[PDB]
Design a protein around this ligand. Structure first.
Ligand SMILES: CC(C)C[C@H](O)[C@H](O)[C@H](CC1CCCCC1)NC(=O)[C@@H](CC(=O)N(CC(=O)N(C)C)[C@@H](C)c1ccccc1)Cc1csc(N)n1
Ligand SMILES: CC(C)C[C@H](O)[C@H](O)[C@H](CC1CCCCC1)NC(=O)[C@@H](CC(=O)N(CC(=O)N(C)C)[C@@H](C)c1ccccc1)Cc1csc(N)n1
Lengths: 333, 334
């Protein structure tokens, strides 16, 4: 068809980006995270206990209120790198932008404080493929395609640096207002995951890692870029950042001194200068500044893999092309 | 007819949206706000006393330089919710978005510093009905409607979010499909003469906490914030745990991102604002107060008492003001 649906995104501290969706009739509105790293749609259930403070502090779905609702009740546990959520599976109509589709989705009943008490949004909308779908429920994008409608079988993401417009997702295409140049594509290693092959990470001048290829997930639901523990160690040493309990820090004023990091993808370099990978809250010689790179050990079958998260997507407007199973990149604006 | 014309607006910090017009021959250019809550056109006059500092800081209109001017002289006072200006009527040629009308406007000679010294713009273009016109002078849109050039008898508003982009835009004669998505939902006005509509309820969180039984809502582009009566905003504010500063309501910045949705039940549909939509999240500090883009305003009868949906609302919802059929349509802006 010749349609395109923009979804406005809020950016909260550059770590969380979310937009609204409406479930039901008349719709209920939830804040969600559009995650290319998974394929299930889930929101909190009014049937969630207050025992969990997470539910107590999150919008909940009230099936009673939905004209269009449909019982189902299959139980489900969705497991994320950072947490787990369990609930059961309902159906209703979900409103995304100007689009509407009958979605099967989970109504969450168990949600831990760690990490959900740190989430500002309510649930998540899996932009992944059906192969990774807990319960072989069809992911929302699949359902949207079916309905014809969209001009192209792709979706794009723009993430902004927090200061304005926090970001934007375009279903059916891309916004030429939010990127410079033209896209360069990198094919999927295999279908089922949004993961491409990378063939080197350079620190400044030199390929320091992933010399003979490695994998990268392009993950819109990952705050930071991660790499295996061993690569991050190596990398940080080369940068001279230091482990501070949780993260790697650098003296604020020394931020500008760090080298550029380049990801070699599909024959091109994607370069990040320290300004893109250090959160320079100051430039004081008296303060420590945080790096938005973290180690993450992803289990097979998926990992060991690099995950290119919001850190990278802030820099490169991203296009996920389902038609050709390829991911494209252009410099954002 | 067949024209469609647009005015591009500048967005000053989310609170002032102004476009330009030209008056006279040769044209004298002015920054103006296009306001649906009023129907007069005015600019500051070269006759304005320099004793009004607002008249030292804004472009003044000088008839002595205009060949197309026709003197009128009739005095007129313009009262707005937040201030007043006085002047007299003049007539000259006004160019808006490419359209040229011979318009009767006011030359303001008395301009107070509050609010005007805070104004990035010079005057106002009232986009309301002749019913609201001081002096019974014909409103500009109506004059345009007389020319028979517009494709449609509508005008729409796009208000954008800022930057460190295109500020907003008025389309004269239609709408702009690049700035909205989905379909319009039309509400009919209660009656001609005022851009007001029936509202059945306002919800904080879940609960139609307010406006049970029903209320009025003015859709007014000439207002930065959304406004309710004082007693309604009193309730609202308490629900959000907001704290009344001089002229505004505030909240601890850190509390900001979790404030509950507020819904406006209009024409059977529900218009929802999320915390992101109505809090000026200028920081996350637990140690700073952040402004809410909502406030009280007691509008006297006949229009009031009412709610007024200002730039806060229009920002999320593209608005079409339809004269042909006397109605307002909202769509989801993009
Ligand atoms: C194949 C897997 C790598 C896919 C992965 O499970 C999914 O992308 C999953 C989706 C998330 C959507 C919001 C609800 C939590 C889960 N992201 C994740 O699990 C990433 C979560 C994630 O990015 N965060 C923030 C974070 O890590 N930093 C550094 C702020 C966690 C704290 C989170 C949790 C809850 C609310 C908000 C944030 C961790 C990660 C893995 S690889 C990497 N670079 N980062
Ligand atoms: C029937 C009436 C409600 C109609 C009302 O008089 C008109 O819409 C009137 C026209 C304005 C055009 C710009 C010059 C000032 C006057 N707007 C208004 O009076 C709104 C003015 C208005 O919104 N402002 C900004 C303001 O209130 N804040 C909080 C930034 C005034 C203070 C202002 C000051 C400085 C510069 C510019 C504007 C106040 C309001 C009333 S209902 C509501 N939600 N907000």
């Amino acid at each position: 068809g010749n349609t395109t649906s923009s979804v406005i995104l809020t950016n909260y501290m550059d770590t969380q980006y979310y937009g609204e969706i409406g479930i039901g009739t008349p719709p209920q509105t939830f804040k969600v995270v559009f995650d290319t790293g998974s394929s299930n749609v889930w929101v909190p259930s009014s049937k969630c206990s207050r025992l969990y403070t997470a539910c107590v502090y999150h919008k909940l779905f009230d099936a009673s209120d939905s004209s269009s609702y449909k019982h189902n009740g299959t139980e489900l546990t969705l497991r994320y790198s950072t947490g787990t959520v369990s609930g059961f599976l309902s159906q209703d109509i979900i409103t995304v932008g100007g689009i509407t589709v009958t979605q099967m989705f989970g109504e969450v009943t168990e949600m831990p404080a760690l990490p959900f008490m740190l989430a500002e949004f309510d649930g998540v909308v899996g932009m992944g493929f059906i192969e990774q779908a807990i319960g072989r429920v069809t992911p929302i994008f699949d359902n949207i395609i079916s309905q014809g409608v969209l001009k192209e079988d792709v979706f794009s993401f723009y993430y902004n640096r927090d200061s304005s417009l926090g970001g934007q997702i375009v279903l059916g295409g891309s916004d030429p207002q939010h990127y410079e140049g033209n896209f360069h594509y990198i094919n999927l290693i295999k279908t089922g995951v949004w993961q491409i092959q990378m063939k080197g990470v350079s620190v400044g001048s030199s390929t320091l890692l992933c010399e003979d290829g490695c994998l990268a997930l392009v993950d819109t639901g990952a705050s930071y870029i991660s790499g295996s523990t061993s690569s991050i160690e190596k990398l940080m040493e080369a940068l001279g950042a230091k482990k501070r309990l949780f993260d790697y820090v650098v003296k604020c004023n020394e931020g500008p001194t760090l080298p550029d990091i380049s990801f070699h993808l599909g024959g091109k370099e994607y370069t990040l200068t320290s300004a893109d990978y250090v959160f320079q809250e100051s430039y004081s010689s008296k303060k420590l500044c945080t790096l938005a790179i973290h180690a993450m050990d992803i289990p097979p079958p998926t990992g060991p893999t690099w995950a290119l998260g919001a850190t990278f997507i802030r820099k490169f407007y991203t296009e996920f092309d389902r038609r050709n199973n390829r991911i494209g990149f252009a410099l954002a604006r």
